[PDB]
């Protein structure tokens, strides 16, 4: 009686891949603008009392 | 009644944007770079070549 002990199996099939990686949030997070120079200086204006609070 | 300021004229805070005034300026603009010239060869009349 052929049953499946005799025969024998070439390969599997490859069904799924898997690589696992987060969910990156460096995009949502944080404000972000090129810099075309390899220093970037961002200004901030305040705007003062007479007493510069 | 708001000042303007000047670096202090120090090499130091001119280039950083440092000034005793209301606006530190980004930097010092850029006036264009000087490179240094190539000098000249002699040639090669005055010994005989045979490449």
Same mark, same amino acid.
């Given at each position: 009686? &052929?049953?499946?002990?005799?025969?024998?199996?070439?390969?599997?099939? +490859?069904?799924? +891949? &898997?690589?696992?990686?987060? @969910? +990156?949030?460096?995009?949502?997070?944080?404000?972000?603008?090129?810099?075309?120079?390899?220093?970037?200086?961002?200004?901030?204006? @305040?705007? +003062?009392?007479?007493?510069?609070? | 009644?708001? $000042?303007?300021?000047?670096?202090?004229?120090?090499?130091?805070? $001119?280039?950083?944007?440092?000034?005793?005034?209301? !606006?530190?300026? %980004?930097? #010092?603009? !850029?006036?264009?770079? !000087? /490179? /240094?010239? %190539? #000098?000249?060869?002699?040639?090669?009349? %005055?010994?005989? !070549?045979? #490449?």
């Amino acid at each position: 009686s &052929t049953t499946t002990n005799s025969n024998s199996i070439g390969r599997p099939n +490859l069904v799924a +891949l &898997t690589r696992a990686t987060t @969910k +990156l949030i460096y995009s949502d997070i944080v404000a972000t603008q090129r810099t075309n120079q390899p220093v970037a200086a961002f200004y901030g204006i @305040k705007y +003062l009392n007479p007493d510069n609070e | 009644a708001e $000042i303007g300021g000047d670096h202090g004229y120090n090499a130091t805070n $001119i280039a950083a944007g440092q000034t005793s005034g209301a !606006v530190t300026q %980004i930097g #010092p603009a !850029v006036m264009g770079m !000087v /490179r /240094r010239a %190539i #000098p000249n060869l002699i040639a090669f009349d %005055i010994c005989g !070549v045979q #490449p």
